[PDB]
Every structure is written in C-alpha cells, then in structure tokens.
Amino acid sequence: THKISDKYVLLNCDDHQGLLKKMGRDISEARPDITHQCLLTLLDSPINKAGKLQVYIQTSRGILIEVNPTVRIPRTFKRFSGLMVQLLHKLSIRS
Amino acid sequence: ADVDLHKRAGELTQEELERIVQIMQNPTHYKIPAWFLNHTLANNVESKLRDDLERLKKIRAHRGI
Amino acid sequence: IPTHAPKYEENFNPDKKSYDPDRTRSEINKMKAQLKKERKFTMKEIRKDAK
Amino acid sequence: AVPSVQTFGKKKSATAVAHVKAGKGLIKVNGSPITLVEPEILRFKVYEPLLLVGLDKFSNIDIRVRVTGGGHVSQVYAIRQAIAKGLVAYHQKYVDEQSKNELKKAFTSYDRTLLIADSRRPEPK
Amino acid sequence: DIIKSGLAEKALKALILQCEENPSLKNDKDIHIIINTGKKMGINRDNIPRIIPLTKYKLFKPRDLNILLITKDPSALYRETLTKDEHTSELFKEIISVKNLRRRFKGSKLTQLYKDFDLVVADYRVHHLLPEVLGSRFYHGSKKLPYMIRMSKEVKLKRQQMVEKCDPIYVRAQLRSICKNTSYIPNNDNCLSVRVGYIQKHSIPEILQNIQDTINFLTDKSKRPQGGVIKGGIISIFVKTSNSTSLPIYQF
Amino acid sequence: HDFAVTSSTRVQIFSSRTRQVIKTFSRFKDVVYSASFRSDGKLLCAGDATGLVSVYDSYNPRTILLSINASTHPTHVTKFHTQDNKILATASDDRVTRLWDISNAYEPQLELTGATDYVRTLSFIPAAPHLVATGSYDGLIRLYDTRSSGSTPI
Amino acid sequence: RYANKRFRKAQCPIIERLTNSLMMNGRNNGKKLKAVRIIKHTLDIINVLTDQNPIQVVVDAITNTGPREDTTRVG
Amino acid sequence: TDRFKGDDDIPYKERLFERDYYQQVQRGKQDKKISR
Amino acid sequence: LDYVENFDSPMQSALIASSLDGHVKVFDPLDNFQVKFGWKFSGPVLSCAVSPSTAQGNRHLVAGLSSGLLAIRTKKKKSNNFQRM
Amino acid sequence: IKDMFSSAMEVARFEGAQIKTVSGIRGEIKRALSKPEGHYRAAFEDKILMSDIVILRSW
RNA sequence: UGACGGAGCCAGCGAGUCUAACCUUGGCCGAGAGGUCUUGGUAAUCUUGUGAAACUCCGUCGUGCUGGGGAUA
16 A cells, blocks of 8 residues: 555556655566456356355565455456555455 | 243244233233333533633643644 | 455545544544544643643 | 370461361361362362371371461362371371371372472572 | 312322423422421431321332342342242342342442332341442432331241241232332421322322321321321421422411 | 153153153254163263254253264164164164264264165164164164175175 | 473373463463363263273373474574 | 346445423512512 | 063063054063053053163153153151160 | 632643641642542642641632 | 353451542521421442452353334334
8 A cells, every 4th residue: 555645545557657666666566456367266266156265365565365255356456456455454344 | 821931932832822922912901010021412512612622722822733 | 155245435544534424423523532632732731831 | 185286287378277186087177077178179189188198097086177368279288288297297296106207208209298388489580 | 187178289280280391300200298297206217118008099009110129148038939939929120138239239330220120128137237238329318218028927036046938928918018008207307208199190189188198197196106206286288299399288 | 760751852851769850951953853871871862853963961961962963864763882882873864874983973983874765763782782773664674784894784 | 380490391290281281361361270170071071982091092192192393494 | 146246336425425389389489588 | 662671570571562552562572472561541652661670769661652741650669875785 | 639620621720739738737739630520639748637628829 | 261040168468536429309497607307310449357359069041243313013
C-alpha cells in the first residue's frame, strides 16, 4: 500500500511512473496482476470446487495471507486492488 | 400440561402440543404466577459540553492544535 | 464449494473511520472523540500554566 | 506419667503439630480422622508415612495433628512431615533406637522432605 | 369512629385524575395514607412490619409479584421442601440463605436486587441481621422492607433444641396473609404512612373501605400486640402517591 | 445387578435393588438400537439409527468414551466380545458385520461380509473365541472363523 | 526441587513430567491439581481401552515420540 | 452461489446521497408557608 | 432369546424366548428343550432378559414390549460383665 | 475532599495550593479526582477527621 | 479448559473516642434557627477481624457470535 496526497493504492506497475523509484524499487517487480491471475486460476479450477485445495499467498514483504476456497474473488483488476488494500490494512475481510 | 418432561419435541401427541400452545396463550386465566413471564440526550448535552469547553478555552488564552 | 462474496468498502482509508449508517451513533461518537481530546488538552494546558 | 512426643511440620506457611502418645491406634487430623483429609487427591501424600513403614508401627501409638495456615497442598505437606518426624521421634524416645533409625532410613529413602523441610530461600544469581 | 365521606372521595378522585396525567409522577402506582396523630406513640422503630388485617379486599394476590425468600444457615431443607411440594413450588421467585446472599449480592448488585424483587420475606430467626446484609436501600423508607415468616409452627422452649422442619402450607398461608393484608411500621413521632390499595387494581369504594379498616385497626383498644398504637386522638389523614402532594382527609 | 433398556433415543440403566432408573443416556441423534455392557461391565456400547456406535462407560453417562462412525445405514446390533475385551462387533443395515478394535476406532479389524439381507444378530462361540455366529433376514446363520479372510463364512 | 541443577530434571518421575508439561497455557498456569486429575482420568481410560499398564503405555509413548535426529539452521 | 457471476457491484456513495381540589390544596399549603 | 446356566434353580439351565404375541416361555435344555413355564403380557413382547448366573441378589425377569412399556418380575431373597459371667 | 469546587477544570486551576482544616492541620491539594466532578485528593499533616472543614484562603 | 444450581474447605498482611453517600415526596412541633417522623429515586470497592478467590465434589444442559426506525400476532 501507499498513501497518496488521502488515497491508498496498491502499488501497481501502471498507476504511476515513479512511485516505485521514489521509494527505491524497480518497475520490473511491482506485479500484483500476476497474483491476480493466479488467484483466478486456483479459484476457478475444479479442485477448488471439490474442496481439495487451500491457497496461501505471501508477499515480498513476508506478509502471509490465508485465502479460503469459498472466496468469490473480483474478476476485474481494480476491484481486486481496492480489496487487497483493505486486506492489508484491516487484516481480515468478511463475507 | 402433563406432557412428559423427557420426551423429545418430535415425539409429541397433537393434543399435548396444542395444550402447550393453549397454556402459553391464556396464561393469566390458567392462574400461572405472573412473575413467570415478563437517545439524543447524549447528543444535546454533549453539544452543550463542547460549547462549555469552547467558552472555557476562550476565556483563557488558548489555541487549537 | 459454497461461494460467498467478500464485504469491503471501495476507496478505503484505514485511518478514516468506516461508515456506520446511523447518524445518531456516528455523530455522538465523533463528538465523544472531540470532547475527550479537547477536554484533555484544555485541562492539561491550564494545569501546566498553574504550575 | 504417660509417654508423649510433640513434633512440628511446616511448608510455605502451613504448620502442623503432631502429638504422639501410647495408645490404641487412632490417627486424627484437626479432630477428624486421617481418612478425611482434603483435597482427596493428596490424601496419599498424607498416607505415605503410614504405608511406607506399615501400619504395625502405628498400631500402638495414636497421633493427633493440628494444622493451621497455608493452603490445601501446603497443609497436606505439613501434615505428612509432622506424621513422619513424630513417628521417628516416638521411636527414638520410647521404643528402641534400632527401630528409630530403620524408620529414618525408610523415610529418607523415600524422600527426606518427610523429615527435613527446605527452610531458607532464595539465591542471588 | 367511622370516616367515609365526600371529602375523602373527592380527594381520592382528584388524586387519581391527577396521577393519570401528571408527567412527573408517571411511575408511582400506590396509594398511601398519612395518619397524623396527636400524642406521640412511644414505641421505637424496629423494622418489623406489622400486618394490618383487611376484611374483604385482598389487595395483592401472592402470585403476580416477585418474592425473595431469605432462610436460615443450611437452607437445604427449606429449599427442597419448598420447591418440590406443588403447594409452594411456584410461589417464590428466589430462595437464598443469608450466608450466600451476602456472598453474592454486594454493592450495585443490591440496587439490582432491589429493582429485581417486589416482596422480601425472611425467616424470623435471620431477619434481624438483614440490615447490613441487604443494605440501606431496603430500609430507607418502607416499600421492599422484609417481612418475618415462621416456617415451622413449632415453638422454641429452653433446654431443648428446635427440630428442623418446614411446612409449605404454612408458608403459603402466611405469605397469602402478607400479600392479602396491608402492613405498617411504627415510630416515635406522630406521622405514620400506610400503603392501602393500588393505582389501577383497585377502585375508589374498595380503597375507602380498606382505608376505614386500617383506621379502625390502628385506633382500636384491643389488638394490643399489633393494632393498639393510636392510644390518643387521631387528628388527620392525608392521601398521596409516592411523589404527590398530600390530599387531606378527616381534619378532625 | 443392573440392566440397560433401549427405548427410543435414550438408554436407561435400571438397578436390581430398587427396580428404578438409576442412570440414563439421552444424547443420541436418532433412534438408539442396541445397548450392551462389556464382558467386565466397565463400559457400554450403543448402536444408533445413524450408524454411530457410541460407547460410554457404564455408571457415568457423561463421558462418551469413543464414538465409532460405522456404516451409513442404521447399525442395529453392537456387542463386545465375550472372551476378548477390546473388540466390538457392530452389524448394520449394510449386510456386513464388523469387528472393531476399540483402540483403533477408524478402521475395523475385520469386516465380516458375505450376507444377502439385513444382518440383525451377533453371537460369539463361548469357548472358541475366533468364531462369530451372525444371523440375517434370509435364514442362514452364517458363522466365521476370524483367522481366515472373513468375507466367506466357514 | 528438580530445576536447580542441570540434569536433575532427568529423574523427576515421568508421570510428573507429563503433568507439569500438561499444565501450561495462558489459561491453566499453576493448576497442578487439575493436571493431576486429568492425568488420573486419562490413565484410567488408557487402561480401559487397552488392557495393559498405562504407565507402560506412557513410557512407550515417550520412547516412540522422542526424535533421534534434527536439523539446525546453519549460519 | 456464483458460477463466473462474480461478486455484485456496490452502489456509489453519491448514489446513496442522491436518492382542581389538588391545585387548591397545594396552593393552600404554599400560601400557608408564605404566610408564616 | 437368552439363556442362564447353573443358577440357583431346579432347572439346571434355562432358555427363555420372547415371541411377539404376549408370551415369553422358558425351555429346559436338559430334557430336550421342553417348555416349563410362561408369562403373558399386554402386547407384542419385543425383547426379554433375565438376571445372569451370578446375580447373587434380587433375581429379575424383564420383558420390554413393542407397545412402549416394560414389565419386571422379581424373586426376592447384653453387656460385657454379663457376657463374661 | 468533597465540594469546594464544581469541576475538574476548577481543581486543575487550583492544584498544588495549600489548604488546612479548622484544626490547624495543614495540607495541600494533590490531584483532581476523576469520577465525581468537583472532588479532589489532598494530603494533610496527619489524619484529619470527618467532622472538619478544609479551607483555602485566597484574595 | 463452557453454562447454570448446591455442598465442602484452606491464608497472610491490616486496630488514632476512629470509617465516611447524594437528590427528593410530605406530616407535626417551633417566633425563627432548626428538630423529629414519613417517603421515592440515583450511586455503592460495604461498614474493623468471621471470611477469600482459584480449588475439590455433586445434578442439569450441550457446543457455526451479533442491530435499530419498517412488516404479522
């Protein structure tokens, strides 16, 4: 997450030019879309539907998230970003 | 209502269940002892207290934050 | 597997408080925090100039 | 004119005075018998000075223990220490010394906190 | 002697029609008379509520009010032989002894207890040591003040100990008498307040008849245990609810 | 000196000094079918109409010692071995009786199949403790040596 | 007193070491009579499920469970 | 129960924005006190 | 069915059987399983038992009917100076 | 001390003052109490009695 | 590692003629000062000594949390 001056954004690769370089990191890393497309794959695969799978995702900052199988992940990207910000800042997301 | 104290709720005769409903439905007629069965003020006094506190700051020599 | 949807507020700010839909608990809680911080600040100021 | 022997047992703040005299065989704690010592899962902590050496030692003496202070487990520990060192002291005084230090060997081989309490603590590391 | 007249009825009508409207007294539901006597009744206020017997109007039924029973030391005999008897099996809301009563209810729990029950009835043996157990809330005034009951119908003689038994028809009997009749507590001065009637359970002629009942019983020559207390000339009555003024009756 | 009576959804241990219920087991979830004491009398098995053989200890109805999830049909007869003390025979409306070990109550130590209709009775042979005489609704008192395979009566 | 020298706890009796390890959480620190009571109950039902010595059962449980190698994270 | 149906949208904040003996005797005792 | 053995009885061993018709009957497996006594209850007798061979006390026979009720029948079982003188 | 002030703001204004009873027992206002509004804690020379009146002379 | 409801039983500190509420409804006496009596509500870590709580034992129940203005008794 980043505070923007009154806004909290998930650090995408495209919502900025140089927020990552004003913090220090490189543009070839700020990739939340690929954990989005992996959440889509694991949460639409039939083994999740039969309930023989659980997902844990973990960040480059070592922040471990347990992803339940029953979650209806938002299929578009910016809903996912706005959801992931409240995940990182409320520590829990309700049904 | 004379129904068994240890029967379950499925095993009930219909006269016994309607006897339960009757006993609940007219309780004072059945001489049941009647002991068996039984907002903005904060907002307005709080605005007066914040009025009081504003007056108390301004009679002294204060500032906000 | 049953499929529930995740409850969240879009355009979040964790420092800002959430939207309780009532205006007679949210506003009295706002003026609770206002009354507490202004009371503590005022009487701290007057006890330090009393010292 | 009667033989009598008084000993003391102590744990954390419990105290237990045992009077041993020549009698019929009756063991009493606070007036009630020894088989009514609570909390009843430490009744064998009270019973072990008896069963360690056999009830034929006790069959001619009669002990009585007055216990005061402490909590439940402090009281059963002061009771068993009072019973043990009272029986040893009666056997030193009015029965023979051979039996006295046989009883001392039995109680010390089980645990010598039946006879010597841990008294002064702590350590400055 | 007999006092029942149009001034008394006028006062009670006016007070009823005042309490059915007056918003500062929308909670008090009780009619009390204030007997003003001339001479000072000399007997000191111990807090034993003596019973004024009414003749033809039971003013409270013993089943539509919460009853707390305070018993002797072990309370096992009283609790079982009260609760599993079917004569008194549904009569008492709570039966607790003095020991665990003062274990459980202390402090603000006593205000909750006072707001919880509506008739405090205690054993006559342990009644006298209630005022430090129960607090000052029960004894400031008299509306939840505890009543004595005997439980055994056995007298105590010297040199021999009372056998312990309780009698549930007797406890129902005197609790029926307690909720049936009304009660007064004497004092040293001239004033004396008695609750007679209710606000909507009772009507004006029955309240007047039991008022006159209490006048007879307090001014009487006989009943020198309980009722011979107005030994001189009674001067006035007033009538009030718990937060009203005092509407005067029988100005002598 | 006690006898366990199976009514529906409660098992009542009566005593034989006063003939009244001393103890009662109420916490079943369907109709309870079988109730039997172990050979030593230390514990009690009860077969249920959901296939959940609950074994309590006798003379304490509050400690469910274990609960075997047997077959999905109603288990109808449950009893411990008469010679052994740690195997429990439960037969159900699955046409198969089972010898569970009450240490390993996840899989049965023998699964006596071979029946064609609604096994309702067990017995054990009182001297040879390998021999289980089961009985079903097609006549045919089948009986099994347990040292062998167990899917075929001898 | 089994915690004032280095290896003296190696001869506290093994039922007591099991009891002392049983009474540790945030909830039941110090409740040794509760832990003694539940060790008494669990030895009763070990004997009633497996007709053998529950002291032999707990001795065997120690000797089976205690590992024989392990990895330390190298610097 | 969602089979690629996803979670639904939520409406906007501005979408939720744009949418007598008594009285005689009590005055008698009052005037009695004031008379004294 | 059930069966008792060597209990205190003239019948050395007994097999009693319960048969859905009110009747529960006892057969003696020594003289070729002949019937010897029987009881009749008020419904279909669904299960029966008797107290076992080492009961040593009050000896019981219980039969539980399909009607919802149960029947139990039982058979039941100066001074030291003066004495020293 | 019960009522010589009406609120914690007044006691905060008058913290640290010297008070005394009518029996000459000196003392000093230590801290405004929290729960009742005009009450405070004072520390005296020795144990004052319930029958006394504390006093703050001011001009 | 629950929820009710009883029973059992165990301390150590602490002894200044000192220790401690408030707001009311009314009656009478008194010149007033005030006294006494009566009454309802709010607050309460009880009041100086006896005693604890956790604990032990016994009966009953039985393990997916919560809201106000709308709707039916």
